[PDB]
Design a protein around this ligand. Structure first.
Ligand SMILES: O=C(O)c1ccc2c(c1)CCCC(c1ccc(Cl)cc1Cl)=C2c1ccc(O[C@H]2CCN(CCCF)C2)cc1
Ligand SMILES: O=C(O)c1ccc2c(c1)CCCC(c1ccc(Cl)cc1Cl)=C2c1ccc(O[C@H]2CCN(CCCF)C2)cc1
Lengths: 239, 242
């Protein structure tokens, strides 16, 4: 069904899948508390969003967990950068939690992360990133980030990787369709596609940097565990 | 001059710029159990870095940037560049990493030191992906040039905007070059945009491996984990007219 979707149907499915914008609730302890709680509430909606990305639920639950374990922070960050796009010099964590780089000084390594996120928001603003492009990029992160670390090389894993690459190809077709509809020339379409996909390497960089600093802080729960993600993804049919 | 190059001239300039394949420095008459695997890899990386700076200077548009910006791009991309090179050399050696013609290692050989088997598995999966895609040498040189220009552009006055604009124009030329190569190979327009995306998404995995590699080098208390600004600036061999 996912591979049968047209570019317009892909765009519509992604726009419809969008999670809501949540609200929050400034010492090292206070701001971290608000950020941790916000990340945890957004994670719940991210799992529901992932289930609505065409082709995602066709995967095994172990592969769905793997993709989310790899991409959760990149997904939170691209969302954050998108919400912050029209707020130069600020990160819109929530409508009631708009922070600047100085507010990042409160926690270890947080300013470096804030500066990288603010530069990404600036880049989105410079490119005049559209909402329809944003939902395609966020879906790409979900399907791409973890596809290279399945490693089992089982016949099932080969079938899963082929499926992921076919869905990713449909998303590329969708991105090109959007650019063609916006009146870009073929040359401009290929150049913009590359510009958008290269920002994903910076998003990966920030996610790794963020995770490194989260571990340096040494808390009990750092990453959503396999079991926690499976618990949320491993739904029953009784509702 | 760089922005005036045709797609064919860009391809030729990149192929001509290619650094040499180096050999690992060890006594091949000795047991090698007596060779530090970390020592061999560190020495090889250090040797390759010198040739990487020479190569970077031959990437069209790179030397038009300020020296401070050239150093920043290399500080950001050096490990990703070593890794893409490694994955390319290993492409036709399933299950092995061709560090050098005399240093072909498997995943078990990564069990020697902390976090290396994880890095080896990720690199082997990338080689496998290149093999599946039948990556061409002309595409590889474009991707390696992209890593150099893209990796540090996000972590950079009107000169800075001009510097970023120049980098993005060179990156656009490389995208045009990759599309040209695919069009010449007989791919349809749809296949061209799909393959361009597939190649650029692998760069996110290359960034991931570079970050994981550096994290493990910092965990071991490795001397000079990263090339210093001064070392890179020295290797760039600045003109003497400033
Ligand atoms: O846009 C969002 O909703 C959003 C929310 C929180 C964050 C971010 C985006 C990314 C940038 C800032 C940031 C952070 C701040 C400081 C440092 Cl050094 C590192 C990072 Cl990445 C976090 C964070 C903060 C805490 C955090 O903790 C959670 C990680 C997963 N949770 C535990 C597992 C589930 F039980 C706790 C996750 C992200
Ligand atoms: O394809 C090459 O020539 C090539 C050479 C060495 C490496 C790689 C490719 C990448 C994979 C394996 C690897 C590594 C092995 C183990 C661990 Cl935990 C992490 C990594 Cl990334 C290194 C490495 C090893 C050491 C190393 O040392 C640095 C410390 C001193 N140097 C930088 C400062 C002077 F410039 C280099 C750099 C890369």
């Amino acid at each position: 069904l996912a591979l049968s979707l047209t570019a317009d149907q892909m765009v519509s499915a992604l726009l419809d899948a969008e999670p809501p914008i949540l609200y929050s609730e400034f010492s090292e302890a206070s701001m971290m508390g608000l950020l941790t709680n916000l990340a945890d509430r957004e994670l719940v909606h991210m799992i529901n969003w992932a289930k609505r990305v065409p082709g995602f639920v066709d995967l095994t639950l172990h592969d769905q967990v793997h993709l989310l374990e790899c991409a959760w922070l990149e997904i939170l960050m691209i969302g954050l950068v998108w919400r912050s796009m029209e707020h130069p010099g600020k990160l819109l964590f929530a409508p009631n939690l708009l922070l600047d780089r100085n507010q990042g000084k409160c926690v270890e390594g947080m300013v470096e992360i804030f500066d990288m996120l603010l530069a990404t928001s600036s880049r989105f603003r410079m490119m005049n990133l559209q909402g329809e492009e944003f939902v395609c990029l966020k879906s790409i992160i979900l399907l791409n980030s973890g596809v290279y670390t399945f490693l089992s090389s089982t016949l099932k894993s080969l079938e899963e990787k082929d499926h992921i690459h076919r869905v990713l190809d449909k998303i590329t077709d969708t991105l090109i369709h959007l650019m063609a509809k916006a009146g870009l020339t073929l040359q401009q379409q290929h150049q913009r596609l590359a510009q958008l996909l290269l920002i994903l390497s910076h998003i990966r960089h920030m996610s790794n940097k963020g995770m490194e600093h989260l571990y340096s802080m040494k808390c009990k729960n750092v990453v959503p565990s396999y079991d926690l993600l499976l618990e949320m993804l491993d739904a029953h049919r009784l509702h």
